[PDB]
């Protein structure tokens, strides 16, 4: 019988955004501003918004988001917060959020709340929100300009050690949240932190890790559950620890830039220790995938520039990768650039994967970090499970020249006993019941499928190797007998601050008590326990925490099935299993099954 348990110690922000599904759908000004190397004029912003309202907002792309080129945004409130995107704009953020509202859309903002504009510093009348004793001028070290070493002289970096700093930063974050902004994109924190860029050299004064982590904690608290926090230049120190603890999204690639295949799949394949660890998103999504999934991080593959690609097959591959990885779906084509390419963004079956909360993983091949061994995960074969037990499966051919067959086998790779109905989502074709998804792919082409296992008496299997991992839990394959490609280990005691865990999203038709099974290994020489909970997306407890017991077995190659019952509510539940301080021993986890 199960006993009551304390809650697990977490190491992620664990917000409603990362718990509820994949990244947001939005449009971004980058397709204008990058090639122009200039802030978007207000009329161009307007014409793009009107175009989105009539053509993409109905497909869920209902955030219009600004980007950089903000040095020319100098006008601020009495507390130093920018009033609009650029000084040339006749209307402020509020006017544009309402204009968007009238078209069933919302405003996304790119800004870093550690930026302090020189114009605000120079106006002695401006003071920190709620702190009339602190002038905005009192927030900065003289000469400490953002991008100082490459000529920057319009934005200071905040000195977070100065009185008023927390109030300034939190006020800035809440300023946008209050304006109705659901998404805040915070860039240049690696430049803030270490004053360096691997593409350039020295860029400005460093501010250090402690200050970076403190600033992130302030931003997290101020954003709360109302506004999604995108970290656009993460250094990802310590396997992304501070970013995971404080943000919702992390960029995993070098900038889209001029777009096309070389930005999607080229440049370099190796890892480096500096921003960005991987250059192309095939490698970055693959390399950071151990940090993805419900309650962990959403990985951000940057912007889609459909018209910069050479063919429609490449455009499909671009979209399929973003969807496979659970990334935000960010259109950067302007109304002038879109041409006849709207279709790439508006395939309803592909979008349905994003709506349903697909967060895929590359096929794991070994436990070794991808940063150390590129053989450890397959950049070209992705799968993820939806809450209802169905799957998204994506197959890619990154060769420039050869046609290559790619296959995901439902038993050997995914770890299912059932096979599944397979639908090709670009052919819009039912392939019927099958044991695998396969495609003979032309160079740069891809295929994406919805795979729907049958459910004899409601049985739904969720493989651990394709779920979300936290606190040290991870993939392995070093004891035989597992179903699928492997299992999760690290569900053991350790020295750390966080408890290792696995999170599964599960969807059920009604509130009730459901039979749950856990296929596991345990050769610790004694009984082991893990803590199990069910929660709503908002974190509220549906069941548990309870200690579930796992009888000791003969060897680490021996697998058993522990039986239990779990209360779940109608719709989405997050079922988390982890090893707390009061748990005993250790297990390896292969899968869970729910009879729904």
Ligand X SMILES: OC[C@H]1O[C@H](OC[C@H]2O[C@H](O[C@H]3[C@H](O)[C@@H](O)[C@@H](O)O[C@@H]3CO)[C@H](O)[C@@H](O)[C@@H]2O)[C@H](O)[C@@H](O)[C@@H]1O
Ligand Y SMILES: OC[C@H]1O[C@H](OC[C@H]2O[C@H](O)[C@H](O)[C@@H](O)[C@@H]2O)[C@H](O)[C@@H](O)[C@@H]1O
Minimum CB–partner distance for residue 229 and ligand X (Å): 16
* Torsion region of 367: left, alpha or beta (phi above 0 gives left; psi -120 to 50 gives alpha): alpha
Q: Which does residue 499 bind out of ligand X, ligand Y, none, counting CB within 5 to 8 angstroms by kind?
A: none
Contact 103, 89 (CB under 8 A): no
Our CB check for ligand Y shows the closer of 23 and 580 to be 580
The interface mask with ligand X, positions 237-276, x = CB under 6 A, is ------------------x---------------------
Q: Which of 159, 197, 248, 413 is catalytic?
A: 248
Min. distance of Cβ 187 from ligand X in angstroms? 5
Cβ neighbours of residue 326 under 8 Å, at least 6 residues apart?
A: 21, 22, 23, 292, 293, 298, 299, 354, 357, 358, 359, 360, 384
Enumerate residues 414-443 that contact ligand X by CB under 6 A: none
Residue 30 binds what, of ligand X, ligand Y, none (CB under 5 to 8 Å, by partner type)?
A: ligand X
Buried b (16+ CB within 10 A) or exposed e, 531-559: bbbbbbbeeeebbbbbbbbbeebeebeeb
Query: 567 has which bridge partners?
Result: 513
Residue closer to ligand X by CB (options 96, 191) is: 191
Q: Which of 254, 182, 183, 214 is nearest to 114 (CA)?
A: 214
Taking CB under 6 A as the criterion, which residues in 139-178 touch ligand X? 147
If phi over 0 gives left and psi between -120 and 50 gives alpha, with beta otherwise, what is residue 155? beta
Contact flag: residue 9 with ligand Y (CB under 6 A): no
Q: Residue 33 or 385: which CB sits closer to ligand X? A: 33
E strand residue ranges, 203-343: 228-231, 249-251, 298-300, 329-331
- State yes or no: residue 380 binds ligand Y (CB under 6 A): no
Residue with nearest beta carbon to ligand X: 68
Q: What angle do CA 411, 415, 418 make, to 5 degrees?
A: 55
- In the list ligand Y, ligand X, none, the entry touching 232 (Cβ below 5 to 8 angstroms by class) is ligand X
With respect to ligand Y, which residue has the nearer C-beta, 62 or 489?
489
Q: Which of 586, 589, 592, 594 binds ligand Y (CB under 6 A)?
A: 586
List, in order, residues 6 or more apart from 1 with CB less than 8 Å away: none
In terms of CB distance, is 71 or 434 closer to ligand X?
A: 71
By rule CB under 6 A, what string of x and - marks binding of each residue 188-207 to ligand X?
---------x-x--------
Footprint (CB under 6 A) of ligand Y, residues 37-76: none
CA-based R_g, the chain, Å = 24
Provide the mask over 461-490, with x wherever binding to ligand Y is found by CB under 6 A and - wherever it is not.
------------------x---------x-
Distances, alpha carbon 399 to alpha carbons 363, 485, 543, in Å? 18, 24, 48
Q: What's the DSSP call for residue 39?
A: P
Q: Does 26 bind ligand X (CB under 6 A)?
A: no
Sign of the CA dihedral running 138, 142, 146, 152: positive
Distance CA 352, CA 372 (A): 35
Pick the closer one to ligand Y by CB: 10 or 586.
586
Minimum Å gap between C-beta 315 and ligand Y is 43
Q: How far apart are CA 387 and CA 403, in angstroms?
A: 34
In terms of Cβ atoms closer than 10 Å to its own Cβ (0-12, 13-18, 19+), residue 572 is buried
Instruction: Pick between residue 30 and residue 172 the one whose CB is nearest to ligand X.
Output: 30
Q: Which is nearer to ligand X, 113 or 415 (CB)?
A: 113
Give the separation between CA 396 and CA 282, rounded to whole angstroms.
10
**Residue linked to tokens 């990768």:** 321
Q: State the nearest-atom distance from the C-beta of 184 to ligand X, in Å.
A: 14
543 belongs to the catalytic site:
no
Given ligand X, ligand Y, none, residue 508, with its beta carbon under 5 to 8 Å by kind, binds: none
The minimum distance between CB 264 and ligand X, in angstroms, equals 15
Token pair listed for 253: 């690639």
Closest CA to 398 of 562, 518, 266: 266
Of how many residues is the chain composed? 596
Contacted entry of ligand Y, ligand X, none for residue 71, CB cut-off 5 to 8 Å set by kind:
ligand X
Residue 248 falls in the annotated catalytic set: yes
Task: Write the interaction track for ligand Y spanning residues 529-568; mark x where CB under 6 A is met and - where it is not.
Answer: ---------------------------x------------
Cβ–Cβ under 8 Å, residues 468 and 577: no
588 binds ligand Y (CB under 6 A): yes
- 69 is a site residue for ligand X (CB under 6 A): yes
* Catalytically annotated residue among 67, 187, 388, 583: 187
The site map against ligand Y for 488-527 (x = CB under 6 A) is -x--x-----------------------------------
284 vs 578 by CB, closer to ligand Y: 578
Q: How many residues bind ligand Y (CB under 6 A)?
A: 6
Q: Which partner, ligand Y, ligand X, none, binds residue 586 by CB below 5 to 8 Å per kind? A: ligand Y
Give kind and range of the element (H or E) at residue 560: strand 560-568
Interface with ligand Y by CB under 6 A: which residues?
Answer: 479, 489, 492, 556, 586, 588
Q: Which residues are catalytic?
A: 187, 248
Interface with ligand X by CB under 6 A: which residues?
Answer: 30, 67-71, 147, 187, 197, 199, 232-233, 255
């Amino acid at each position: 019988p199960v006993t009551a348990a304390p809650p697990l110690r977490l190491a992620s922000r664990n917000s409603v955004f990362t718990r509820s599904g994949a990244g947001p759908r939005y449009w971004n000004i980058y397709g204008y501003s990058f090639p122009h190397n200039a802030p978007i004029p207000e009329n161009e912003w307007k014409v793009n918004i009107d175009w989105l309202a009539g053509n993409f907002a109905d497909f869920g792309y209902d955030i219009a988001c600004t980007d950089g080129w903000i040095e020319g945004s100098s006008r601020t409130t009495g507390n130093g917060y920018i009033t609009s995107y650029n000084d040339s704009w006749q209307h402020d953020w509020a006017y544009w959020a309402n204009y968007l509202a009238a078209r069933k859309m919302k405003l996304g903002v790119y800004y870093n709340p550690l930026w302090v504009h020189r114009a605000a510093v120079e106006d002695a009348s401006k003071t920190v929100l709620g702190r009339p004793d602190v002038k905005i001028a009192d927030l900065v070290v003289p000469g400490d300009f953002f991008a100082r070493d490459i000529g920057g002289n319009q934005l200071y970096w905040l000195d977070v050690t100065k009185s008023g700093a927390k109030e300034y930063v939190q006020g800035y974050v809440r300023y946008f949240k209050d304006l109705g902004v659901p998404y805040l994109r915070i860039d240049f924190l690696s430049w803030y932190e270490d004053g360096r860029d691997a593409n350039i050299g020295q860029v400005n004064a460093p501010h250090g890790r402690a200050n970076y982590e403190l600033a992130l904690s302030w931003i997290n608290e101020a954003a709360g559950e109302d506004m999604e926090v995108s970290l656009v230049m993460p250094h990802m120190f310590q396997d992304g620890s501070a970013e995971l603890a404080n943000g919702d999204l992390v960029r995993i690639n070098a900038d889209a830039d001029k777009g096309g295949w070389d930005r999607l799949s080229g440049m370099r394949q190796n890892w480096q220790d500096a921003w960005p660890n991987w250059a192309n998103p095939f490698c970055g999504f693959t390399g950071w995938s151990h940090r993805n999934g419900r309650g962990q991080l959403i990985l951000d593959g940057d912007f889609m520039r459909a018209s910069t690609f050479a063919s429609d097959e490449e455009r499909k591959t671009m979209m399929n990768l973003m969807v496979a990885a659970g990334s935000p779906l960010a259109i950067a084509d302007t109304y002038q650039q879109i041409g006849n390419n709207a279709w790439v963004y508006t395939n309803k079956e592909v979008l349905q994967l994003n709506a349903d909360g697909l967060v895929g993983k590359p096929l794991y091949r070994s436990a070794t970090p991808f940063s150390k061994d590129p053989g450890s995960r397959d950049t070209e074969r992705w799968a993820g499970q939806l809450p209802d037990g169905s799957w998204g499966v994506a197959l890619f051919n990154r060769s420039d020249t050869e046609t290559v067959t790619k296959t995901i086998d439902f038993a050997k790779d995914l770890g299912l006993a059932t096979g599944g109905n397979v639908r090709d989502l670009w052919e819009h074709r039912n392939l019927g019941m099958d044991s695998r998804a396969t495609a003979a792919l032309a160079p740069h082409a891809s295929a994406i499928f919805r795979v729907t296992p049958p459910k004899m008496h409601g049985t739904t299997r969720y493989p651990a190797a394709f779920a979300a991992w936290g606190g040290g839990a991870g993939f392995n394959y070093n004891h035989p007998g597992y179903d699928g490609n492997g299992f999760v280990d690290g569900l053991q005691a350790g020295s750390g601050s966080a408890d290792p865990l696995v999170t599964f999203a599960v969807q059920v038709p009604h509130r009730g008590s459901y039979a749950i099974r856990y296929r596991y290994a345990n050769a610790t020489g004694d009984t082991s326990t893990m803590t199990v909970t069910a929660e709503k997306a908002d974190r509220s407890t549906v069941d548990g925490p309870v200690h579930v017991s796992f009888p000791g077995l003969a060897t680490w190659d021996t697998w058993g099935v522990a039986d239990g019952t779990i209360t779940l509510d109608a719709g989405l539940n997050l079922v988390t299993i982890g090893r707390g301080a009061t748990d005993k021993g250790a297990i390896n986890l292969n899968w869970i099954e729910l009879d729904m």
